[PDB]
Design an enzyme around this catalytic site. Structure first.
Site, PDB file in Angstrom:
ATOM      1  CD1 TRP B  55      23.434  65.006  65.883  1.00 42.29           C
ATOM      2  CD2 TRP B  55      24.666  66.020  67.436  1.00 42.29           C
ATOM      3  NE1 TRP B  55      24.697  64.469  65.829  1.00 42.29           N
ATOM      4  CE2 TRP B  55      25.464  65.053  66.791  1.00 42.29           C
ATOM      5  CE3 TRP B  55      25.220  66.791  68.454  1.00 42.29           C
ATOM      6  CZ2 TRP B  55      26.785  64.836  67.127  1.00 42.29           C
ATOM      7  CZ3 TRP B  55      26.543  66.577  68.803  1.00 42.29           C
ATOM      8  CH2 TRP B  55      27.310  65.588  68.146  1.00 42.29           C
ATOM      9  CG  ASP B 121      21.320  71.863  65.291  1.00 46.40           C
ATOM     10  OD1 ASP B 121      21.991  72.170  64.263  1.00 46.40           O
ATOM     11  OD2 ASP B 121      21.748  71.058  66.166  1.00 46.40           O
ATOM     12  N   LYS B 145      29.750  68.908  60.874  1.00 43.69           N
ATOM     13  CA  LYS B 145      29.118  68.281  59.716  1.00 43.69           C
ATOM     14  C   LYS B 145      29.883  68.463  58.404  1.00 43.69           C
TER      15      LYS B 145
END
Lengths: 311, 311
Positions: B55, B121, B145
């Site tokens: 990510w 993030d 998530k």
């Protein structure tokens, strides 16, 4: 927790019209754990599956590890733009379908008849329309629709189907055990569900599954009409297989060159989140339960204005 | 809806200790839209990023499309098993970190100091511990998530950082516009959040972020102690970088051959969902906020008994 789960069960029964003979289970583990549990619990000699996309093919692969699988149709030849014709053979242990294939914009919209136990992955579409739960032996919905919580996977199971497998099923994977222990054997986070309770409460508040479907149908119908009238675009999916939740479209042959310009034109009109999957290209409008009618109309106007600008 | 959003804002302020000067925004679109919006809104001449996993690398790639990016450390050389050393350069527009790298079991656990606006993030870890929100200029958390709803992405933004970019920002991508319109400009599904309200209510009920972290720390500490004492297993991550939410471990060198047998041994003891990502192999225990202490102990006992069985 017993009270949130138990309330959620009674909301599910009411909202979905779930009759006696069905058990509702909540699991950790996503749809992928159900791919395994379905075969572990129901595939004694052989099963059959319908291959209509990525998740269908994943459920297939997992079942293949357990035992004999017949794929009785696949639309992979044309990149999954239609639902195959099939005849359900009467000598298999179950038939598994995946009712909405998100990135391809196809859907099985009716509750089909079947000579053998019907298993359906309704991960994207479970609370989008009324279902005649009686036609199904097992409905499940998880892992990842779309991009959210650790989350819970719902299983609605016609308990009488169980017990036919000769293989020794590990306890943690045996539906009977989870039923016996009220879905409390290996629980998911209470937060992981607590939502579903809320979500069901909202569906009920707004007027129910029938209402919600009638709204999605209206949205899909307005958008596909534009895609059909509009010379710049083409729907990629065979008419009869069109999803009302995911609407896939691409540039017409003459206008493949304008694909980037339209994405930008739409951006400037405030329209984003419509980029098609890598494997389809073009575009994909996600008509969520209550995305509004009005924002579909805004996409429609944007498409139309774009058409006029290039003729 | 204004009341669910507005209540969620006041719960967030309270639970997270968010002081004045910060705006809370809710978006559709997942973390990937923030990867774009962060750079669109803050990258005027150049930004810097820390590459600590998948990510992180995606946020980097997206920013690279907008402008100059310096990656001031990457741990890609050793398959992301540590957090790199770095020095934040004082002449960049912002520094972007990703604080928990789920599949690699690494975490930045402290709120770091920075000479330039700090963007984080925190998609996996946002409500897992207290944060000193003052150290941050922008915190976001979405998309996926883990494996749940269409979902909402949270953005907490120190409003004074905005306005420096010379590029023309399309309105739909401009944080100022969303702030100006109370996060009501292009809303996500009300159901998509309605959860967060509940989730925050639960965190508050159980005793708050500090409590939750103290519980995760205890769980991680018991499991890493076993992984450290236990001759069959090895932690893959450098000690100081160990995540308390995702605990990655692999077989020791002598015992790589027993990897399948342990997965089965654990299955038979009722333990599943611990398979490591494809790119790490071995195992990964997800210590969710309230996975219990007790099930970690059950994994610990299973690991220990397995050790004794093979010595």
């Amino acid at each position: 927790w017993i009270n949130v789960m138990n309330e959620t069960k009674a909301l599910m029964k009411e909202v979905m019209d779930i009759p006696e003979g069905y058990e509702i289970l909540f699991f950790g583990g996503g749809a992928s754990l159900q791919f395994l549990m379905v075969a572990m619990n129901l595939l004694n000699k052989k099963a059959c599956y319908l291959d209509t996309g990525v998740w269908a093919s994943k459920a297939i692969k997992e079942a293949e590890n357990i035992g004999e699988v017949k794929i009785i149709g696949t639309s992979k030849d044309k990149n999954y733009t239609y639902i195959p014709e099939y005849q359900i053979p009467s000598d298999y242990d179950y038939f598994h379908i995946t009712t909405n294939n998100t990135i391809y914009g196809t859907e099985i919209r009716k509750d089909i008849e079947s000579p053998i136990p019907l298993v359906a992955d309704m991960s994207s579409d479970i609370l989008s329309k009324p279902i005649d739960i009686s036609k199904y032996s097992l409905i499940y919905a998880g892992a990842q629709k779309n991009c959210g919580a650790a989350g819970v996977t719902i299983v609605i199971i016609k308990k009488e189907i169980l017990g036919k497998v000769q293989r020794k099923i590990p306890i943690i994977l045996d539906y009977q055990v989870h039923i016996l222990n009220n879905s409390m054997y290996n629980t998911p986070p209470v937060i992981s569900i607590f939502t579903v309770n809320q979500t069901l409460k909202y569906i009920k508040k707004i007027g129910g599954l029938k209402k919600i479907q009638e709204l999605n149908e209206e949205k899909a119908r307005l958008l596909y009409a534009e895609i059909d009238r509009n010379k710049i675009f083409r729907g990629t999916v065979r008419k009869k297989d069109r999803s009302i939740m995911n609407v896939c479209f691409v540039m017409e042959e003459q206008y493949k060159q304008l694909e980037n310009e339209f994405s930008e034109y739409a951006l400037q009109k405030g329209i984003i989140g419509i980029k098609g999957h890598r494997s389809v290209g073009g575009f994909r409008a996600s008509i969520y339960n209550a995305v509004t009618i009005e924002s579909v109309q805004a996409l429609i106007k944007c498409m139309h204005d774009f058409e006029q600008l290039h003729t």
